[PDB]
Design an enzyme around this catalytic site. Structure first.
Site, PDB file in Angstrom:
ATOM      1  N   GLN A  19       0.817  -1.203   0.000  1.00 19.17           N
ATOM      2  CA  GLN A  19       0.000   0.000   0.000  1.00 19.17           C
ATOM      3  C   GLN A  19       0.856   1.261   0.000  1.00 19.17           C
ATOM      4  OE1 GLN A  19      -1.485  -1.096   4.153  1.00 19.17           O
ATOM      5  NE2 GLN A  19      -1.663   1.133   4.220  1.00 19.17           N
ATOM      6  N   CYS A  25      -4.992   0.359   3.923  1.00 18.12           N
ATOM      7  CA  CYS A  25      -5.030  -1.065   4.272  1.00 18.12           C
ATOM      8  C   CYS A  25      -6.439  -1.634   4.166  1.00 18.12           C
ATOM      9  CB  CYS A  25      -4.497  -1.282   5.687  1.00 18.12           C
ATOM     10  SG  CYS A  25      -5.227  -0.152   6.861  1.00 18.12           S
ATOM     11  N   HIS A 159      -5.125  -1.646  11.697  1.00 19.25           N
ATOM     12  CA  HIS A 159      -4.561  -2.100  10.432  1.00 19.25           C
ATOM     13  C   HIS A 159      -5.391  -3.254   9.913  1.00 19.25           C
ATOM     14  CE1 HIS A 159      -1.734  -2.564   7.238  1.00 19.25           C
ATOM     15  NE2 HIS A 159      -1.336  -3.764   7.622  1.00 19.25           N
ATOM     16  N   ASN A 175      -0.579  -9.496   4.293  1.00 19.87           N
ATOM     17  CA  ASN A 175      -0.409  -8.088   4.590  1.00 19.87           C
ATOM     18  C   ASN A 175      -0.235  -7.327   3.281  1.00 19.87           C
ATOM     19  OD1 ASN A 175      -0.231  -5.830   6.087  1.00 19.87           O
ATOM     20  ND2 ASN A 175       1.764  -6.272   7.032  1.00 19.87           N
TER      21      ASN A 175
HETATM   22  C1  LIG Z   1      -4.634   1.129   7.995  1.00 19.56           C
HETATM   23  C2  LIG Z   1      -3.446   1.257   7.032  1.00 19.56           C
HETATM   24  O1  LIG Z   1      -3.648   1.687   5.896  1.00 19.56           O
HETATM   25  O2  LIG Z   1      -2.313   0.895   7.485  1.00 19.56           O
HETATM   26  C3  LIG Z   1      -5.477   2.407   8.072  1.00 19.56           C
HETATM   27  O3  LIG Z   1      -4.812   3.396   8.826  1.00 19.56           O
HETATM   28  C4  LIG Z   1      -6.932   2.136   8.517  1.00 19.56           C
HETATM   29  O4  LIG Z   1      -7.850   2.184   7.712  1.00 19.56           O
HETATM   30  N1  LIG Z   1      -7.163   1.843   9.806  1.00 19.56           N
HETATM   31  C5  LIG Z   1      -8.516   1.593  10.265  1.00 19.56           C
HETATM   32  C6  LIG Z   1      -8.524   0.734  11.511  1.00 19.56           C
HETATM   33  C7  LIG Z   1      -8.683  -0.757  11.239  1.00 19.56           C
HETATM   34  C8  LIG Z   1      -9.462  -1.005   9.947  1.00 19.56           C
HETATM   35  C9  LIG Z   1      -9.384  -1.381  12.444  1.00 19.56           C
HETATM   36  C10 LIG Z   1      -9.155   2.933  10.622  1.00 19.56           C
HETATM   37  O5  LIG Z   1      -8.527   3.750  11.283  1.00 19.56           O
HETATM   38  N2  LIG Z   1     -10.410   3.111  10.177  1.00 19.56           N
HETATM   39  C11 LIG Z   1     -11.200   4.299  10.412  1.00 19.56           C
HETATM   40  C12 LIG Z   1     -10.710   5.517   9.632  1.00 19.56           C
HETATM   41  C13 LIG Z   1     -10.325   6.689  10.527  1.00 19.56           C
HETATM   42  C14 LIG Z   1     -10.087   7.979   9.744  1.00 19.56           C
HETATM   43  N3  LIG Z   1     -10.973   9.064  10.131  1.00 19.56           N
HETATM   44  C15 LIG Z   1     -10.812  10.337   9.746  1.00 19.56           C
HETATM   45  N4  LIG Z   1     -11.698  11.252  10.157  1.00 19.56           N
HETATM   46  N5  LIG Z   1      -9.810  10.739   8.971  1.00 19.56           N
END
Ligand SMILES: *[C@@H](C(=O)O)[C@H](O)C(=O)N[C@@H](CC(C)C)C(=O)NCCCCNC(N)=[NH2+]
Length: 212
Positions: A19, A25, A159, A175
């Site tokens: 990515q 992710c 993640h 991953n």
């Molecule tokens: C993961 C990555 O690309 O390494 C990425 O940060 C991600 O999507 N993380 C998720 C958490 C998992 C899926 C549990 C996440 O944080 N999802 C919610 C999005 C939060 C963003 N919100 C705003 N307002 N920018």
């Protein structure tokens, strides 16, 4: 369900992706499960567009993160293009679904695995690759090179990855950090520890697409 599952050996897993710096992710995880279920149902292994979910999943936040469930709901309600048609750019752009011709594949819905339940996740993985989440922030996960990973890690999941198999003591994870991380891009994460969260919170939030 059998003692070992490895969807790579069934031809249901495309090459490991990277990515990059984009927090995409969630789309890579969703796409792994879409590639898997399309192979399982149709016999053909194709690559589908992470970029399309990045651009078009309005409930997610582009490179600032997102929801595998929401990307899978996007693929079930509309569809997804081949990765060739809608390649990965590592940055969120305008939704270009409408300009890339007809969708390449479509699913019929999104189930959730009962969370915090190892067997429920194992049951689903036996049927198809599953989108799962975990805590990847710990240096131990970041620096993982191989073996059955036991941590250290908390359950502060951040993640999205994809479970594409399992064995007696691990769950096999694709991953999206390129082929140089872990075991050619995979990690085997210990299971059977009795921690309801799973190692690194692996049982926190698991989704898979449904395709009739
Ligand atoms: C993961 C990555 O690309 O390494 C990425 O940060 C991600 O999507 N993380 C998720 C958490 C998992 C899926 C549990 C996440 O944080 N999802 C919610 C999005 C939060 C963003 N919100 C705003 N307002 N920018």
């Amino acid at each position: 369900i059998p003692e070992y599952v490895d969807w790579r050996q069934k031809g249901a897993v495309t090459p490991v992706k990277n990515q990059g710096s984009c927090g995409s992710c969630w789309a890579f995880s969703a796409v792994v499960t879409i590639e898997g279920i399309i192979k399982i149902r149709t016999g053909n292994l194709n690559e589908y567009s992470e970029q399309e979910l990045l651009d078009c999943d309005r409930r997610s936040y582009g490179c600032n993160g997102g929801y595998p469930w929401s990307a899978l709901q996007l693929v079930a309600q509309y569809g997804i293009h081949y990765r060739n048609t809608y390649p990965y750019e590592g940055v969120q752009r305008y939704c270009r679904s409408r300009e890339k011709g007809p969708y390449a594949a479509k699913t019929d819905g999104v189930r959730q695995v009962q969370p915090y339940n190892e067997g429920a996740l194992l049951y689903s993985i036996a049927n198809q690759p599953v989108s799962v989440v975990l805590e990847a922030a710990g240096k131990d996960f970041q620096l993982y090179r191989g073996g059955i990973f036991v941590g250290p890690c908390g359950n502060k999941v951040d993640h999205a990855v994809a479970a594409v198999g399992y064995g007696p003591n691990y769950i096999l994870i694709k991953n999206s950090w390129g082929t140089g991380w872990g075991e050619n891009g995979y990690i085997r994460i210990k299971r059977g520890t009795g921690n309801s969260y799973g190692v690194c919170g692996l049982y926190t939030s698991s989704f898979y697409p449904v395709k009739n």
